[PDB]
Amino acid sequence: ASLAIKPVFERFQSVIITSGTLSPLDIYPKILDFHPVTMATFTMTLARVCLCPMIIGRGNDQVAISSKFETREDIAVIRNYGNLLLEMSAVVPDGIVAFFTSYQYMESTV
Amino acid sequence: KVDEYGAKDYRLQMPLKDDHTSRPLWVAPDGHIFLEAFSPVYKYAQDFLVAIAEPVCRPTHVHEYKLTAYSLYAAVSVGLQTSDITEYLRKLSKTGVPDGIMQFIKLCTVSYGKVKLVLKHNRYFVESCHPDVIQHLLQDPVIRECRLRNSEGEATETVSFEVKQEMIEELQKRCIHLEYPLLAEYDFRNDSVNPDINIDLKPTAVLRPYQEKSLRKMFGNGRARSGVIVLPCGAGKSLVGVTAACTVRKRCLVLGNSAVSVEQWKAQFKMWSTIDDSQICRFTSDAKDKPIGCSVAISTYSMLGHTTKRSWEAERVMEWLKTQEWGLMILDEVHTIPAKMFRRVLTIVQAHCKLGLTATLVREDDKIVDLNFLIGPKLYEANWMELQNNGYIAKVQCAEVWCPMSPEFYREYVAIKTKKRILLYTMNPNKFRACQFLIKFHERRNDKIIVFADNVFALKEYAIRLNKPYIYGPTSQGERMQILQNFKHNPKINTIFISKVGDTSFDLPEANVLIQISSHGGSRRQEAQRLGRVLRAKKGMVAEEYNAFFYSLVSQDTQEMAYSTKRQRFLVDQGYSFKVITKLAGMEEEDLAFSTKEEQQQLLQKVLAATDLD
């Protein structure tokens, strides 16, 4: 893909690249085959904690939650996801979004 | 020294130090240990005591533990030496540790882990790192007979020697006499003769913290060690056994009381283990499977202990089992093992690692001292009250209801002095009315009712008059299963009458109300295990401390009072309370059978008609 961006680096004065999902700062120079002048990540300072990221790898029955294709067809994982969604609907406010891994898996789960 | 009041004057032998509140333990020189639960170091003290001391009583506040040689051997097998144990005891004992207990610990620990028994090539070898002990033990006449000898009678020559299989259990008792107990050590990872099996643990299986602790204690230094683990009924004991079998990865043998236990174990293995069904075989009298490729075999003790001539196929299966070397063996309901026929099964079967699981170990015949060497020391025993607090099991509401004896029955009760007297108090019309009122109340409350009665005649009469299903000796298995399914699914029927067969002959469906009318005669452990198996945790009433109901109908001023008092001792030692109920509220308003005294006279006529034959 770097070829598609290769002339842009070699013709314009500078290129500005920014995104909210830039966890590795070194793969992109490798992906685009170039050496950016500055590679800086701006840490977010909050007076009030607006985000509460949580990881739930265990279901109600302590089932090991995984999204591997071997475990995607597991009925227990689907039931745990359904119970989690039910509790979230009964607890969390109206806005609920759930991102699955594939369309077929989502349809089977539904 | 004994005081005039009977208290043992242990003040002189126990030097008290000023660290009273911080140290929670009292260590009397008699071997008993007292622990206070309200102490902040209770959890650490509880963990230390469980590892080294066998509990005696665990009520709410003060727990009493006992120190035994088997417990010391188990602690040594865990990996604890004398120095650390002594240091921890002195750090926790309110008074100084008496030297008598100190010398008792020193003597036992040094003698542990000396003699080793190895089962290789279907042959038993006794070897040790100290040939002087081996040479000394040769002089014993019992050991001479137990030692295997050549076909000409010549004795066979860390040097090991073959030992007769038929004399293995005899050698186990002789080790106690020689004070050199055997070591049940198995090469968990160094095993090469027995290949591994494609069996793993499903992710749906979750090990509770006490279960994981018990398993880790059993797996001393990563090696499986033979022993006994005591867990309450319904606490996933079958799940623990399946997990242990998966961890072992070697050939597995499981033994149950009846075919129902075999089916339950097979279902649990399919539910939690990854072993293929082709490698799972049932050596039962009706449903038989080919022993070829049988990675895990599930059977019953009586099937392996059938002294009478067996079927031709069963003989072939037994021959294959004897030829096959079993890395792991699993035994259920260890309390029946002390029977001679079931003990002979241990000699018959050649297994490396043997693990026994049950709910109780207090045999009324106290044949447990030999059991400590038949399998091994008790590896773990969970606290019933603690698991109730954790919510793993239902917090049972126990009550003893005293049913007054009718004067007509009472005079005949005193008149009769033989064994026919059981029918008189087991058929109390007042007890019948109390049971009827309880059944009505629990049906109005929509509760599952299980009425247990050892007496066949009394159980049948109660079930017939109350018009409820009855389970007794024959109880054709198809009809039994139909009745069980009706109890589980049909809301109209929620009361099942079960005879003595309800202890272990089949699986008990989850219920909430258990009423015991008839007693075995002092089965302090059998009925306790039955009660544990009947009642399980029920969702919805977790917050309430009374979610499971147990009632014991006892005839006043009869010998049933003594039987109940003797039986409930085991449960009281577990901290279970028992409230005496003489008056039942609501019986006056509700209409019950035998309201008129002439009906009770008719019941007396019926009972007297049932002679001593019944």
From Swiss-Prot, chain A:
Note on domains (UniProt): Interacts with GTF2H2/p44 via the C-terminus of this protein; mutations in the C-terminal region of XPD do not alter its helicase activity, but prevent its interaction with and helicase stimulation by GTF2H2/p44.
Post-translational modification summary for this protein: ISGylated.
Function comment: ATP-dependent 5'-3' DNA helicase. Component of the general transcription and DNA repair factor IIH (TFIIH) core complex, not absolutely essential for minimal transcription in vitro. Required for transcription-coupled nucleotide excision repair (NER) of damaged DNA; recognizes damaged bases. Sequestered in chromatin on UV-damaged DNA. When complexed to CDK-activating kinase (CAK), involved in transcription by RNA polymerase II. In NER, TFIIH acts by opening DNA around the lesion to allow the excision of the damaged oligonucleotide and its replacement by a new DNA fragment.
Organism: Homo sapiens (Human)
Disorder noted: Xeroderma pigmentosum complementation group D: An autosomal recessive pigmentary skin disorder characterized by solar hypersensitivity of the skin, high predisposition for developing cancers on areas exposed to sunlight and, in some cases, neurological abnormalities. The skin develops marked freckling and other pigmentation abnormalities. Some XP-D patients present features of Cockayne syndrome, including cachectic dwarfism, pigmentary retinopathy, ataxia, decreased nerve conduction velocities.
Protein name: General transcription and DNA repair factor IIH helicase subunit XPD
Family in the record: Belongs to the helicase family. RAD3/XPD subfamily.
Cell location: Nucleus; Cytoplasm, Cytoskeleton, Spindle
Outcome, altering L46P: In XP-D; the corresponding mutation in fission yeast causes complete loss of activity
Subunit structure: Component of the 7-subunit TFIIH core complex composed of XPB/ERCC3, XPD/ERCC2, GTF2H1, GTF2H2, GTF2H3, GTF2H4 and GTF2H5, which is active in NER. The core complex associates with the 3-subunit CDK-activating kinase (CAK) module composed of CCNH/cyclin H, CDK7 and MNAT1 to form the 10-subunit holoenzyme (holo-TFIIH) active in transcription. Interacts with GTF2H2 (p44) which stimulates the 5'-3' helicase activity of this subunit. Component of the MMXD complex, which includes CIAO1, ERCC2, CIAO2B, MMS19 and SLC25A5. Interacts with CIAO1 and CIAO2B; the interaction WITH CIAO2B is direct. (Microbial infection) Interacts with Epstein-Barr virus EBNA2.
From Swiss-Prot, chain B:
Location of the motif DEVH box: 332-335
Keyword ATP-binding: yes
Pfam family of the protein (one): Helicase_C_3
Gene Ontology BP terms: apoptotic process; DNA repair; DNA topological change; embryonic organ development; hair cell differentiation; nucleotide-excision repair; positive regulation of apoptotic process; protein localization
Keyword DNA damage among UniProt keywords: yes
Other observations noted: The TFIIH core complex from patient XP11BE (a patient with XP/CS who has a C-terminal splice-site frameshift from residue 741 in this protein) reconstitutes in vitro transcription about 30% less well than wild-type but does not restore NER in vitro or in vivo. The XP11BE TFIIH complex has all the subunits in the same stoichiometry as wild-type. Purified mutant protein has very weak 3'-5' helicase and ATPase activities. In another paper the mutant protein has wild-type 3'-5' helicase activity. The mutation is recessive to wild-type.
Stated name of the protein: General transcription and DNA repair factor IIH helicase/translocase subunit XPB
Organism listed in the record: Homo sapiens
